[PDB]
Design a protein around this ligand. Structure first.
Ligand SMILES: [Mg+2]
Ligand SMILES: [Mg+2]
Ligand SMILES: [Mg+2]
Ligand SMILES: [Mg+2]
Ligand SMILES: [Mg+2]
Ligand SMILES: [Mg+2]
Ligand SMILES: [Mg+2]
Ligand SMILES: [Mg+2]
Ligand SMILES: [Mg+2]
Lengths: 190, 130, 199, 291, 171, 106
RNA sequence: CGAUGAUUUUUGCCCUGCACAUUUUAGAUGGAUACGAAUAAGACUUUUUAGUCGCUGGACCAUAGCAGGCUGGCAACGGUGCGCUUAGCGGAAAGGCUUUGUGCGCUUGCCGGCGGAUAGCAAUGUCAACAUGCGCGGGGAUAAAUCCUUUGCAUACGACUUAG
RNA sequence: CAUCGGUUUGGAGCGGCAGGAUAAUGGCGGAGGAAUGUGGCACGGCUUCUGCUGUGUGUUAUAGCCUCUGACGAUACUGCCA
């Protein structure tokens, strides 16, 4: 239909300074800085004031309009990543074989080392992404805490850990073992 | 602060001065579609034209109501003095200089070359000591 | 529209077939053409689609003897060359001469690194494709199908751009000094007359 | 129609054409990839195949039925006197592949390597490398200039070394000269190493250690023209077949109306270039050792 | 096509029984008067026991636009044939002439429904006086107050094959 | 004084032809700087010279000329049709011709 | 396609400064006039708020003088050609891009004096870069391969590995 | 090269005449009306009210528009020019 104009309004909290130049967003907050390139989308930005930014698509068709609120949401996730952080909690689910999860360091790199998953002799290693912190929860038994400023990196590490512990050649309705994301929140509770 | 770099586009709006045929000025009085507008001007015929056939200029005729008739457009054009504003820009000046160059004769081109030689002599003399 | 001795085209951002057709008509009409930076050429369509097309091309080989079949060249310049040669009557002597009028390169090797590169607006990707469409860079398509010298070209292209930037900074400085000298000789008798002539 | 029964193809299509090697000296197609952090060292050596022998060895392979038990194994002896370094070549990375930039030679080359450059040595004035030997006149700045060019532009440095074939029992007097790539260290380190080793001998114990796995580049044994039965291992035809049986019965279907490149045909067998990998070094012997 | 709006008036041929038959008028959008009179007889034989042989064309006149430089919104009622059946539809167009909206309609049903000129009946063309008469959002979006929009990514046409400067798309 | 040219540069592009049949009696000429039939109509009737070199000297000169004239425009992009006294040989496709400024009508 | 060794004691070969004459041309006829990157973006000034530039190269450089002759003056101490000469950078196919001093010219930056006719009213009206040969001049260097015999790491014959 | 005759392709060609709704428009005048409501007025969010702006009201005010119409004056288009 070629909608003449579609708009979205970013909301910038008090301590945050968004910074956009040629579709390269640099969001700065108390918790650090996050950057994102949006050069694959045709959008324009207008600073209404220090607390609002207009995101506009001119003469966009259905899909190009659809790509507008996703731009808004990505920048909003950047904003809330540098002011509240992100925290994904993973629970260790096993029927018989305890899952032995350690945070090891080999070759100067951090790894999450899963052992004894379903009794297997194989040792699973998941590389920890830059800017992402892993921790074995003390307050909860069999819990892994994935935290960081970037929601994408945090959720992708959580997904890596969950996906590497898939059950093969069994009825997965019966063999429910694995490591699953149980809580998706923020570092700073609200 | 936020420091957001904004686009400096020219907008299709009532009051935009446009070039038609790279010669004559006109103003947008009402928008028909994404592709078509209604243009009017003192020295042009009021017509429906496609935005591809015209070029938006950086000049806006302020406070022109939508759908204004020829008399209103002419009166407001004379008041805002759009012709003088256009003629003072580098765009119109380059167009005028192109026309003036296109009207030179062979003798005038010879004179241009001679004067260019003199000016180049002076320019090199100034340049070598500075 | 002028007849040039050599037209050196900077191939960056050009659509493969449109540039190929324009260059074909240029070299058929007796014009010498050099295309540099063939690794920066573009094909419309996503990378996977063009890679599938190149794999369809690779399927084709002479059954009874693979050495007789089509010779699938992997370099970006040779991909452009195949596109151009398909648009030339290359099996005549005239087509052979026209093809002798053409040169294609990856990067910008000497002596063209210190010459003028032009663009062809009728074949430029940024001016031709609808702003949302997906495209391929021929340099990435070439590496995915066997071209071995991608990283060599980019190392040599960064060295060339560092040298070309020193050129421009020097050239810009002398342009600034000459402009200051032309400002001094303004409002002179020769300058005032030249302003009335349009110069 | 399809084959009545399935069978694998006879022979490998990855070793075509089954033609004679262009040279008798096997050439290193690929050298080990260079790691800068390692010390400067050679990556290859030239030797002469002496013969085969037998050893006895205690096997150390836990879980094997021969573990801690003696095995009798075939072994090959390669006569390897030290090679002499006589030159150095610089290679430049280009969008068309490696390109040799400059070759710098040593001042003095022995007669056995200067015979390499002659087809009729006995009828010659033996003028090879005499003007080049004059290039070293009292300052040798031409040589230093070429070496500096190699240091400035080369990314791959290879040394030129020849065998001392006079120390072998062979009656051939031509040495074998080959390029051996230098790995380890910077390009400047490689060039300095090559220069300081000009006219020096390099031994095998500086290239290969015991228990190493090494590759062997050689041209195999020539057998001349051979029929399909032994060239490709095809099945012999029945005893009662007219005009002979050491053939391939069907060399093709009607279409394609050509003989395909994948059909076994009679031709030259052996004398091929081969690269054979993973040969364990049981012994790096010393010529001075009487045991 | 390139069309004109015609007033075509015709009647049955007078008989001694009926010496003044009724005059029927139609508004026809045709490229010329030969097709205008052809389309007239096409629709009368869809509506009345008349033929070109038993009838008479009385008048053919061009109907010019009343305000050809006033921007309007038109509603067009259509009856078109698809590959499978016959459908009624209603669409809206923005233009300054009544004829130019019908020309856009013919391009539009060619593009969106593969409906050829022969497959289309124009039931009615109405200028929508009130902004509340506008039902379709693709023309209602141009009736908002203080409408502005840029034209991003301008492509400039060059007279020459080769250009010595980098291309740009500002505007 | 570095330039002495009094003709416009041209190129012999083609014969008059359909897809498969060519007509050597008509040549297609591209005049340099001409991009429209309006521009090309300045050159109608002008004389064209194809200047070439030959092995044998004639009166001490190895330079021979085939003369022609512009007859009409061709297409929409400023090519013209030319008529030479002897047909231009097909080997000259892409060779440069000289578009003379006479017969002058300025 | 590259690197490298040696290149005929023959009046043969190489390099080089000319001079002349020739063969050829897929086609000279002022100049292939060098950032990079983005394109829902670039670049100036203040201030990051805002204003300005583009909207094509119909540009830029060069362009006057018997295809450009012979002479004089003024103003400047510049521009340009050639020859030596200084230093630096360039290996992707660098073979080019700068640069120092010096000498000889020209200079249309400005103003002078003399010459061109008859090619007849047009006739490409002949003006270029590449190559080769030939005369001189100046330097420079002073081989191999094949056949043949031999070998057997090779082999139908050629070819191959050796030795002489 | 000139002029002529035959054929033919053109020009950013120029002028005169006719027709139509004796074009429709537009401009000028009169009458009526409305909103995507100008000024004003009344409430507001950010503005030292710095095209400030939003929502209501109503009908030209400190912008205008639509419809009908009265007397003129053109142009487009299509034809004709021996
Ligand atoms: Mg399963
Ligand atoms: Mg099971
Ligand atoms: Mg391969
Ligand atoms: Mg046998
Ligand atoms: Mg039998
Ligand atoms: Mg068989
Ligand atoms: Mg006539
Ligand atoms: Mg009226
Ligand atoms: Mg007419």
């Amino acid at each position: 239909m070629k909608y003449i104009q579609t708009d979205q309004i970013l909301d910038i909290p008090e301590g945050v300074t968004v910074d956009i130049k040629a579709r390269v967003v640099k969001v700065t907050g108390p918790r650090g800085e996050l950057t994102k390139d949006l050069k694959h989308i045709d959008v324009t930005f207008n600073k209404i004031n220090n607390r609002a930014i207009k995101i506009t698509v001119h003469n966009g068709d259905r899909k190009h309009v659809a790509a507008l609120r996703t731009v808004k949401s990505l920048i909003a996730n950047l904003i809330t990543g540098v002011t509240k952080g992100y925290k994904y909690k993973m629970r260790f689910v096993y029927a018989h074989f305890p899952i032995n999860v350690n945070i090891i360091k080999k070759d100067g790199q951090d790894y999450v080392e899963i052992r004894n998953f379903l009794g297997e002799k194989r040792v699973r290693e998941v590389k920890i992404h830059e800017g992402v912190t892993m921790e074995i929860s003390s307050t909860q038994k069999d819990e892994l805490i994935v935290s960081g400023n970037s929601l994408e990196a945090v959720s992708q590490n959580a997904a890596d850990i969950q996906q590497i512990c898939r059950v093969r050649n069994k009825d997965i309705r019966k063999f429910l073992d694995g490591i699953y994301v149980s809580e998706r929140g923020t570092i700073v509770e609200e | 602060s936020s420091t957001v770099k904004a686009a400096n586009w020219r907008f299709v709006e009532v009051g935009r001065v446009v070039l038609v045929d790279n010669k004559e000025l006109a103003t947008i009085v009402e928008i028909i579609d994404q592709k078509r507008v209604l243009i009017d001007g003192p020295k042009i015929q009021r017509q429906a034209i496609a935005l591809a056939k015209i070029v938006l200029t950086p000049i806006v005729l302020p406070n022109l109501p939508r759908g204004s008739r020829t008399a209103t457009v002419t009166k407001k054009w004379a008041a805002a003095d759009i012709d003088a504003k256009w003629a003072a820009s580098g765009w119109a000046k380059k167009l005028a200089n192109k026309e003036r160059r296109s009207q030179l004769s062979d003798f005038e081109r010879f004179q241009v070359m001679v004067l260019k030689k003199q000016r180049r002599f002076a320019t090199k003399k100034a340049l070598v000591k500075a | 529209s002028s007849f040039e001795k050599v037209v050196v085209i900077d191939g960056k951002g050009h659509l493969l077939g449109r540039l190929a057709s324009i260059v074909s008509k240029q070299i058929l009409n007796g014009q010498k053409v050099v295309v540099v930076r063939c690794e920066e050429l573009n094909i419309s369509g996503e990378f996977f689609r063009n890679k599938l097309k190149y794999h369809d091309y690779l399927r084709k080989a002479t059954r009874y003897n693979k050495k007789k079949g089509p010779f699938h060249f992997r370099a970006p310049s040779r991909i452009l060359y195949k596109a151009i040669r398909g648009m030339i009557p290359h099996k005549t002597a005239r087509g052979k001469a026209a093809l002798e009028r053409l040169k294609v390169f990856e990067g910008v090797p000497p002596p063209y690194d210190k010459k003028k590169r032009v663009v062809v607006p009728q074949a430029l990707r940024v001016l031709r494709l609808k702003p949302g469409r997906k495209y391929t860079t021929v340099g990435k398509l070439s590496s995915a199908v066997g071209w071995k010298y991608e990283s060599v070209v980019e190392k040599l292209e960064e060295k060339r751009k560092v040298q070309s930037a020193e050129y421009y900074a020097k050239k810009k400085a002398l342009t600034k000094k000459l402009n200051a000298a032309k400002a001094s000789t303004a409002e002179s008798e020769a300058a005032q007359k030249l302003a009335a002539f349009g110069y | 129609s399809h084959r009545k029964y399935e069978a694998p193809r006879h022979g490998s299509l990855g070793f075509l054409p089954r033609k004679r090697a262009a040279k008798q000296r096997g050439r290193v197609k690929s050298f080990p990839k260079d790691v800068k952090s390692k010390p400067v060292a050679l990556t290859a050596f030239l030797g002469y195949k002496a013969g085969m022998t037998t050893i006895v060895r205690d096997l150390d392979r836990p879980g094997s039925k021969m573990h801690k038990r003696e095995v009798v194994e075939a072994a090959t002896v390669v006569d390897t006197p030290p090679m002499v370094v006589v030159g150095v070549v610089g290679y430049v990375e280009t969008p068309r592949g490696l390109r040799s930039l400059t070759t710098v030679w040593a001042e003095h080359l022995s007669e056995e390597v200067r015979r390499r450059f002659y087809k009729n040595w006995y009828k010659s004035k033996k003028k090879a490398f005499t003007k080049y030997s004059g290039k070293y006149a009292t300052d040798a700045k031409q040589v230093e200039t070429e070496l500096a060019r190699i240091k400035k532009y080369a990314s791959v440095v290879r040394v030129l070394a020849h065998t001392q074939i006079k120390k072998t029992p062979l009656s051939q007097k031509k040495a074998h000269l080959a390029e051996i790539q230098i790995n380890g260290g910077s390009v400047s380190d490689k060039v300095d190493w090559a220069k300081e080793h000009f006219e020096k001998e390099v031994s095998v114990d500086s290239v290969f250690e015991q228990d190493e796995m090494i590759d062997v580049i050689a041209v195999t044994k020539g057998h001349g023209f051979e029929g399909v039965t032994h060239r490709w291992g095809t099945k012999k035809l029945p005893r009662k077949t007219h005009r002979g049986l050491r053939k391939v019965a069907c060399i093709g279907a009607w279409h394609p109306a050509n003989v395909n490149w994948t059909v076994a045909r009679a031709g030259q067998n052996g004398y091929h270039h081969r690269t054979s990998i993973n040969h364990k070094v049981y012994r790096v012997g010393k010529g001075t050792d009487e045991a | 096509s390139r069309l004109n709006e015609y007033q075509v008036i015709g009647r049955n041929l007078p008989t001694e029984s009926v010496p003044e038959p009724k005059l029927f008028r139609m508004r026809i959008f045709a490229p010329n008067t030969v097709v205008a009179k052809s389309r007239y007889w096409y629709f009368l034989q869809k509506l009345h026991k008349v033929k070109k042989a038993s009838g008479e064309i009385v008048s053919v006149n061009i109907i010019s636009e009343a305000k050809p430089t006033k921007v309007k919104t038109f509603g067009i009622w259509l009856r078109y044939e698809s590959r499978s059946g016959i459908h009624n539809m209603y669409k809206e167009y923005r233009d300054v002439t009544r004829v130019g909206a019908v020309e856009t309609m013919y391009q539009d049903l060619a593009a969106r429904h593969r409906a050829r000129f022969r497959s289309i009946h124009i039931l009615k063309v109405v200028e929508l006086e009130k902004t509340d008469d506008v039902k379709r959002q693709y023309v209602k979006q141009f009736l908002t107050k203080d409408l502005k929009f840029p034209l991003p990514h301008r492509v400039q046409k060059s007279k020459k094959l080769f250009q010595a400067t980098a291309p740009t798309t500002f505007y | 004084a570095e330039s002495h040219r009094l003709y416009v540069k041209g190129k012999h592009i083609s014969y008059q032809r359909s897809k498969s049949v060519t007509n050597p009696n008509v040549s297609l000429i591209q005049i340099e700087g001409v991009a429209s039939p309006k521009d090309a109509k300045f050159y109608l009737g002008k004389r064209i010279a194809y200047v070439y070199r030959a092995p044998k000297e004639i009166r001490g000169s190895k330079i021979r000329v085939i003369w022609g004239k512009v007859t009409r425009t061709h297409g929409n992009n400023g090519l013209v049709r030319a008529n030479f006294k002897k047909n231009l040989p097909p080997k000259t496709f892409g060779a440069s011709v000289r578009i003379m400024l006479y017969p002058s009508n300025i």
